[PDB]
Structure 1
Amino acid sequence: IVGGYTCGANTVPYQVSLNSGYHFCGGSLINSQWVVSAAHCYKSGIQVRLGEDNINVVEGNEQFISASKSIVHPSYNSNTLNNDIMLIKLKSAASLNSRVASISLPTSCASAGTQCLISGWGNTKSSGTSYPDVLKCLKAPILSDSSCKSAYPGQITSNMFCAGYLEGGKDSCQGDSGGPVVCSGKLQGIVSWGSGCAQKNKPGVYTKVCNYVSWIKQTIASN
């Protein structure tokens, strides 16, 4: 997260860190057994880390649970990043509490102008490289489909939306991949892609979660 703020420990209780020896992606806890992330975060040997603030220090509220299976969306295209969504099942159910909590799926799509919260442990610099240990947060509005498409000619599908600031300065970045965009207590987005970070007229692009609620529910119901 570039140009954000320190969230505060366990203030984003649905935020998870995916770890394969190191943090490599974010994710969102959607029930006691399931995490939603980006398809471009797929790899083997995933441990889901819940209750994290400082990802380098065991602070006392963590739950570390290995993934038993991952399900990349059937229509994910890694070239275009269309359908950039994946489900991860935990080997054991997380113990839910005030600091480890699920986020609700949307019942309808969110509009341009809706204010959202984006979070993660990604790079905090737009030019150089610096990775925070503690969770960073950014309040950002959803941008219009027209402005999103104008920013990225030929690249925005019906399964994507832009959020952030056309002026630059505030954005998601490398390492925030797969993490949450939450608006009015609903998971509306997943950190998917962009062109650099916090650059003018290059806002973050996010997977449009409301398009996938049926797939998520049916997949969970049979797996």
Structure 2
Amino acid sequence: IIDGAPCARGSHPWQVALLSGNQLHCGGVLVNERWVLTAAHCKMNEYTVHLGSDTLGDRRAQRIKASKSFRHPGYSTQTHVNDLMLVKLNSQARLSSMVKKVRLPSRCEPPGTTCTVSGWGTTTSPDVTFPSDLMCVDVKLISPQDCTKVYKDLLENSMLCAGIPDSKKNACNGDSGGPLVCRGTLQGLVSWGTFPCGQPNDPGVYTQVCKFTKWINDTMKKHR
């Protein structure tokens, strides 16, 4: 996360981290006791899922392994369209005040809405600095045609853009798959953008969750 601050302790109970070894791979969210939503480009054979602390490596934290994950059937490795994936935890997460489900959207929030993006990703770009504290940055949803000005043909209508004008505020490496919430529901999963991170007027690009609730719910039911 670029030009952000540590997230208020206990306000991202639905945030999880995906680790390979004890080392960060992606961000993600908890849909419920059994399942994690992240980006399809975070796909690995096995995952260790960090839960229940803004602090990475905490003693209080829960780590649960996951051996199965299912990317969206329509994901492209070339274009990163439909960049979303479900991760099935080997055992159920134990909810607490520190472990909650994300409120999935029943609505696509419109351009200009204030949103928060969070992660443990590099706090700097190109030179990298990884924080144990979960980091937050507030951004606004940018409209599709506004974003297309910048990204042209790379953009699908299932991808959502967010940033602040003339601002370095954005997500970066390691923030991948992590949440963008706006008015209390999950609106984005961190997918792609430009390098180095935080170039002003280069919006961060998100997978637009409100377009995929049906696949999400159907996949959870499928693998009951």
Alignment TM-score, normalising by the size of structure 2: 0.95
Alignment match, 2:105: 106
Structure 1 consecutive aligned stretches of length 4 or more whose deviation exceeds 3 Å: none
Is 1:168–1:203's contact at 8 Å kept on the other side of the alignment? no
Alignment match, 1:194: 193
AA matched with 1:7: C
Q: In the aligned structure 2, how far is the partner of 1:166 from the partner of 1:191?
A: 19
SS in 2 for 1:142: strand
Tell me if 1:81 matches 2:72. Answer: no
Tell me if 1:35 matches 2:36. Answer: yes
SS in 2 for 1:176: coil
Deviation sequence 1:74-97 (CA, Å, 0-9, x none): 000011100000000111111111
Gaps of 5+ in 2: none
Alignment match, 1:131: 130
Alignment match, 1:151: 150
Is 2:178–2:190's contact at 8 Å kept on the other side of the alignment? yes
Alignment match, 2:93: 94
Shift of 1:181: 0.4
Tell me if 1:16 matches 2:16. Answer: yes
Is 2:12–2:54's contact at 8 Å kept on the other side of the alignment? no
Q: In the aligned structure 2, how far is the partner of 1:179 from the partner of 1:19?
A: 13
Q: In the aligned structure 1, how far is the partner of 2:55 from the partner of 2:96?
A: 19
Alignment match, 1:64: 63
Alignment match, 1:118: 117
SS in 1 for 2:210: helix
Q: In the aligned structure 1, how far is the partner of 2:148 from the partner of 2:37?
A: 25
Q: In the aligned structure 2, how far is the partner of 1:32 from the partner of 1:216?
A: 14
Alignment match, 2:209: 209
Q: In the aligned structure 2, how far is the partner of 1:166 from the partner of 1:151?
A: 13
Count of matched residue positions in the alignment of Structure 1 and Structure 2 = 221
Gaps of 5+ in 1: none
Q: In the aligned structure 2, how far is the partner of 1:83 from the partner of 1:212?
A: 9
Shift of 1:52: 2.6
Shift of 1:43: 0.7
- Mean CA deviation greater in 78-87 or 157-166: 157-166
Shift of 1:7: 0.8
Is 2:45–2:68's contact at 8 Å kept on the other side of the alignment? no
SS in 2 for 1:154: helix
Q: How does 1:47-62 map to 2 (within 5 A)?
A: 47-55=48-56, 57-60=57-60, 62=61
Alignment match, 1:184: 183
AA matched with 1:30: V
SS in 2 for 1:219: helix
Is 2:45–2:67's contact at 8 Å kept on the other side of the alignment? no
Deviation sequence 1:79-134 (CA, Å, 0-9, x none): 11000000001111111111110111111111001111100011111342211111
Is 1:166–1:202's contact at 8 Å kept on the other side of the alignment? no
Work out the percentage of aligned pairs sharing the same amino acid: 44
Q: How does 1:168-179 map to 2 (within 5 A)?
A: 168-179=167-178
SS in 2 for 1:215: helix
SS in 2 for 1:123: coil
Q: In the aligned structure 2, how far is the partner of 1:58 from the partner of 1:182?
A: 24
Q: In the aligned structure 1, how far is the partner of 2:76 from the partner of 2:154?
A: 12
AA matched with 1:193: W
Q: In the aligned structure 2, how far is the partner of 1:47 from the partner of 1:10?
A: 21
